[PDB]
Design a protein around this nucleic acid. Structure first.
Ligand code: K
Ligand code: K
Ligand code: K
Ligand code: K
Ligand code: K
Ligand code: K
Ligand code: MG
Ligand code: MG
Ligand code: MG
Ligand code: MG
Ligand code: MG
Ligand code: MG
Ligand code: MG
Ligand code: MG
Ligand code: MG
Ligand code: MG
Ligand code: MG
Ligand code: MG
Ligand code: MG
Ligand code: MG
Ligand code: MG
Ligand code: MG
Ligand code: MG
Ligand code: MG
Lengths: 181, 260, 62, 140, 48, 129
RNA sequence: UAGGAUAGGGGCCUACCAUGGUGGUGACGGGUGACGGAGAAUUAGGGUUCGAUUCCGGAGAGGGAGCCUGAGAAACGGCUACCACAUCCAAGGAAGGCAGCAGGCGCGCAAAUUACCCAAUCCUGACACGGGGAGGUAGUGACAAUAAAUAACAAUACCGGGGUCUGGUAAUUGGAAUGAGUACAAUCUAAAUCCCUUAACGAGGAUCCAUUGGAGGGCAAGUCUGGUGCCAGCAGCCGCGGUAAUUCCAGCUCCAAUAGCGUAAUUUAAGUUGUUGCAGUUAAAAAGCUCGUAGUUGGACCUUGGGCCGCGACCCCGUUACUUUGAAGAAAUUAGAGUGCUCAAAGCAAGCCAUCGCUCUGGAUACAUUAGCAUGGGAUAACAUCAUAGGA
């Protein structure tokens, strides 16, 4: 026996049943361009996560409002949706969880929030800035653009202290240029 | 197989040990002893996983070979010694004494006890019958044989045993209205008073227990352990006081603690 | 990740004899309190088998 | 009508068991005749090129499909394997190792080629696609 | 049948070398180009 | 032969309601049909009904109010636990807002919502909506 | 029935006796490319298919058989013999069992190093110490899975659109940014190595150059150019190719997915197996007709009302199905609570202004057919009775 065999893993996305439908291709490309995604799989995994959350919410809506599992798991689901900024305060019911779209999840990415915070000129500039290790959430630098930012962590998105845009020293391009000068 | 198994695969270990899935291929197989393998907490687990005194298997060996650990007043050097319910674990160097009780989630918890309270354990009488020479003798579920027991003591009774003198100093008759702790099943660690005993000829006997807050639960006779005469247990209980909480109330407690 | 801070574990023994008794050998070798004996496990195994083939005090000369 | 009684579970189960044999897919799977096929239930098989042959297409089409006659090694069964990719018959020689595969319709003949359900995929250890695209060369 | 004509057309076809062109951006940038072309700007390959 | 008198009663009522009839006669009568009709009347899907005693299996004359879309039996009377009521309602009811499944339970003959309210399972008699 | 034997029940065996036992509710036999289960894939629900493999149970150590020792073996890294292979020999003999680890032939469509180590987990011995191809570490490894580069910005010029404003384009022009890589070092580690961290170095055609399939329809994308001319070839299917080929061979361009994609059993699609849920006048399909056993299915009828207190209660030694509740139904897997491994797939951790410590830190919960046990219910239904009640 190898102990490593017991580590779990799973798939994060599915491919569409119809590969070449014009309407779906246009909608996916519109979302990808709006949020600077690297491929369709990044949107497909968000759709996969939304599908699992929606299935959970629907299954508790098909149970009584006194069923102790619906009180408990619906409270947990609402806490998770409020924690990541996916739901407002007035939207405090399991019904509103069913109304969530992949747009709501894509709007909470570190790339989208870095772009909307003014730190980057474009969504693609935000993507490169995050992948260049210039962005920290709290004290932790995050080089992963699909990072889902909590509302309590939104106000702590900032330039890295080791980055030239965050008080750090100049990068190798600038330093080499001044050394040439 | 052609004989006894010497190894316990880690996946096949008791779930109340809370052993992690990727810590290795193996779990400590409990040695034979006073308690059953599936219902005990081995000494190595207590020393390394629970008390954090040792960090490795070898460190547990080093601690135990120093003769630092006494189980129910006696020095044990076996790491897989099957310490079980109500056992006294004493370390007479740091001056700390532990009674192995169950929390309401079915997991053994080392409960700190006073020096005087570590001088006795509670044992459950398994059977009373005549031994050789016609001498009456008592046996318990923790493997002890006591000769010349009080004739008023019957099977399923709880006796109070003084570890220093090794005699029955007091006992409790298994009656309706005595506070009990469930030691097996899904209600393990729950504390309540017996309301009635439903007997069925030829099969297991069902005990109906109601806790202090009013919740009612039922369990077999083999999973009931009397801990006090009346509504006052003879030992101290862990923080939960044997009152199981639903996950909603646990979430309420967590929310209140986070808010504070 | 991202640098700036590190985490590890530390032990401080009350005296050097406690450490030489309770500490694993490789950590003492790391701290210079012991010497690494260079051995090949496979060579030990082969020598053990060859010597198990022999009986008596002539085992050492084989 | 069909039986509906609460006590008629056996009738329903036995009827379904007997009627499943009418389905072609079920009977193909559970008859055991697929073990008598040339491939004997395997996706691919290796074989010896016995001789290069050209077999005419169906009536509407007019072409020589230029297949290969292959003797399998696992069971010694002779089959006809199509050689795709214009010009790839010249990569095929007698007494040469070839990896055959299915022609994609599960033993059913494909396209205008009559009686052929096998294609050559690899020759002398080199894929036919690589030889067509000149990514690799056939060993001497 | 006759196997002599195997490879006829592909051998007859004159060899035309591929133009050495600029590479297109690869990954997120390629999706950016496609998004711009079909959302901020006849089929895609119309012979106009 | 007559195998299920409830089926004949419900099918005759359904046909009469589709035909626009304001009265339907049920023969034979039975306690299960009167108990199904009481549930139907309680939910407002039928009006007055009258048991006619003929010193035999009786007759029922039911007033129809045009509020019936369909009523039918489920045969066999499958065992339905409280937990399978959701699956049965999804199978048979037009929506989760309207419609009733009639169950025979040891607590009595009742609609599925009332069965949920007392947490009693049983067997399915039929449905109406 | 009586013995014998065994650790012990038992036709397990023996002696005698009787004629039983199973079977369309499928015995017996045959097939299985059949070890069983936990489970796995796909699943609206129902379902279909798989389950050699790390957890549990069983079985075997070339095939049989028989044993010794021992608490425990019908043991095979123990013995004895036969069968089949097969090794050394001085020909007199002697020694065998990789379905352990690695590795090698062979077989094949099909699968890695004759590495290091007991540091972890744990086991074992006279034992704190030895040993462990259990197990771990590294190597090979596009099985499978997770995250994620291959550029970003600005100015000129163009095209614009909404002169101005704002958008997209250029191997244009500029400075910024950075990791792939290299490498001090530290860290890692049993020792190494990888990762994480980090000096110095490391981008312009940022050649630090992304591919795999396609472009008639299904089905996203060309009725562009050259060649071939029913040939060569393509084509899953329908079809294309005979001189103007949107389909072959190529170039250009475009399309899909993208560090991946193409090709060759099973699920879905399939309400084309249908219990939910298909059909049977003419499309495939009502036996020529009737009787008839088993099976399946079987009319109605029997304690209801009522009020009171107060949703419970009150008042005026036949079974079973079914349902309800409880206890069980290993873990892992699944669902799911908590938790910022930087995210994630994961894991079962952790968190706390920094604490010689603390939070009793956490390490939930749900599900789990059928069969078994127990509790309440008796509407529905099954079986058994059901005018010598000859009742008490
Ligand atoms: K055994
Ligand atoms: K016996
Ligand atoms: K006998
Ligand atoms: K022994
Ligand atoms: K070890
Ligand atoms: K040891
Ligand atoms: Mg006998
Ligand atoms: Mg087999
Ligand atoms: Mg298996
Ligand atoms: Mg096999
Ligand atoms: Mg294997
Ligand atoms: Mg096994
Ligand atoms: Mg064996
Ligand atoms: Mg073999
Ligand atoms: Mg043997
Ligand atoms: Mg061996
Ligand atoms: Mg062995
Ligand atoms: Mg590249
Ligand atoms: Mg099209
Ligand atoms: Mg072309
Ligand atoms: Mg049909
Ligand atoms: Mg006809
Ligand atoms: Mg016909
Ligand atoms: Mg009836």
């Amino acid at each position: 026996v190898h102990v490593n065999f017991y580590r779990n893993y799973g798939k994060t996305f599915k491919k569409p049943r119809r590969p070449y439908e014009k309407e779906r291709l246009d909608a996916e490309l519109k979302l990808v361009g709006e949020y600077g995604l690297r491929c369709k799989r990044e949107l497909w995994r968000v759709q996969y996560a939304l599908s699992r959350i929606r299935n959970a919410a629907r299954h508790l809506l098909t149970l009584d409002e006194k069923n102790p599992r619906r009180i408990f798991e619906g409270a947990a689901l609402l806490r998770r949706m409020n924690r990541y900024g996916l739901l407002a305060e007035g939207q405090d019911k399991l019904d509103y969880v069913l109304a969530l779209t992949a747009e709501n999840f894509l709007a909470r990415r570190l790339q989208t929030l870095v772009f909307k915070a003014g730190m980057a000129k474009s969504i693609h500039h935000a993507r490169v800035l995050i992948r260049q290790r210039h962005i920290r959430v709290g004290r932790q630098i995050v080089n992963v653009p699909s990072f889902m930012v909590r509302v309590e962590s939104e106000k702590h998105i900032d330039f890295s202290l080791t980055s030239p845009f965050g008080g750090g020293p100049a990068g190798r391009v600038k330093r080499k240029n001044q050394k040439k000068a | 197989a052609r004989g006894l198994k010497k190894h316990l695969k880690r996946l096949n270990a008791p779930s109340h040990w809370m052993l992690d899935k990727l810590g290795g291929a193996f779990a400590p197989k409990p040695s034979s002893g006073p308690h059953k393998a599936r219902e005990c907490l081995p000494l190595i687990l207590i020393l390394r996983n629970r008390l954090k005194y040792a960090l490795t298997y070898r460190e547990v060996q080093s601690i135990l070979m120093q003769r630092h650990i006494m189980v129910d007043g006696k020095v044990r050097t076996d790491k897989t010694y099957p310490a079980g319910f109500m056992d006294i674990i004493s370390i007479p160097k740091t001056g700390e004494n532990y009674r192995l009780l169950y929390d309401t989630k079915g997991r053994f918890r080392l409960h700190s006890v006073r020096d005087e309270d570590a001088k006795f354990k509670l044992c459950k009488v398994r059977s009373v019958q005549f031994g050789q020479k016609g001498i009456p003798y008592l046996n318990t579920y923790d493997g002890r044989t006591i000769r010349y027991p009080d004739p008023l003591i019957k099977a399923n009774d709880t006796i109070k045993l003084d570890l220093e003198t090794n005699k029955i100093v007091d006992f409790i008759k298994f009656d309706v209205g005595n506070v009990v702790m469930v030691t097996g099943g899904r209600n393990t660690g729950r504390v309540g008073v017996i309301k009635n005993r439903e007997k069925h000829k030829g099969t297991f006997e069902t005990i109906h227990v109601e806790d202090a807050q009013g919740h009612q639960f039922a369990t077999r006779l083999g999973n009931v352990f009397t801990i006090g005469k009346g509504t006052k247990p003879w030992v101290s209980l862990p923080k939960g006081k044997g009152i199981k909480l639903t996950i909603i109330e646990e979430q309420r407690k967590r929310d209140a603690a986070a808010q504070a | 990740f991202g640098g700036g801070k590190s985490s590890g574990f530390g032990l401080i023994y009350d005296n050097l004899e406690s450490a030489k008794k309770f500490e694993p050998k490789y950590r003492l070798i790391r701290n210079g309190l012991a010497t690494k004996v260079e051995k090949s496990r496979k060579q030990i195994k082969e020598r053990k088998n060859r010597t198990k083939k022999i009986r008596g005090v002539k085992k050492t000369k084989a | 009508g069909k039986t509906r009684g609460m006590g008629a579970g056996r009738k329903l189960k036995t009827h379904r068991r007997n009627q499943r044999w009418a389905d072609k897919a079920y009977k193909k799977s559970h008859l055991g005749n697929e073990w008598k096929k040339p491939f004997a239930g395997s996706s691919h098989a290796k074989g010896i090129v016995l001789e290069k042959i050209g077999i005419e297409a169906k009536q509407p089409n007019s072409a020589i499909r230029k297949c290969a006659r292959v003797q399998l090694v696992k069971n010694g069964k002779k089959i006809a394997a199509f050689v795709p990719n214009d010009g790839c018959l010249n990569f095929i020689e007698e007494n040469d190792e070839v990896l055959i595969a299915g022609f994609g319709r599960k033993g059913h003949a494909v396209g205008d080629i009559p009686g052929v359900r096998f294609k050559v995929v690899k020759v002398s250890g080199v894929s036919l696609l690589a030889l067509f695209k000149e990514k690799k060369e056939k060993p001497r | 049948g006759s196997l002599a004509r195997a490879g006829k057309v592909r051998g007859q076809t004159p060899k035309v070398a591929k133009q050495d062109k600029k590479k297109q951006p690869r990954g997120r940038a390629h999706k950016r180009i496609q998004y711009n072309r079909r959302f901020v700007t006849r089929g895609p390959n119309s012979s106009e | 032969v007559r195998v299920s008198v409830l089926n004949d009663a419900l099918k005759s009522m359904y046909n009469a309601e589709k035909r626009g009839k304001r009265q339907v006669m049920i023969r034979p009568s039975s306690k299960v049909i009167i108990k199904f009709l009481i549930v139907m009347q309680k939910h407002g899907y039928i009006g007055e009904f009258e048991y006619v005693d003929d010193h035999r299996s009786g007759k029922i004359v039911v007033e129809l109010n045009g509020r019936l879309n369909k009523c039918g039996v489920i045969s066999p009377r499958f065992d339905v636990g409280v937990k399978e009521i959701e699956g049965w309602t999804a199978r048979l009811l037009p929506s989760r807002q309207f419609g009733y499944i009639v169950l025979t339970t040891s607590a009595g003959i009742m609609d599925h919502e009332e069965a949920r309210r007392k947490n009693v399972g049983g067997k399915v008699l039929g449905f109406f909506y």
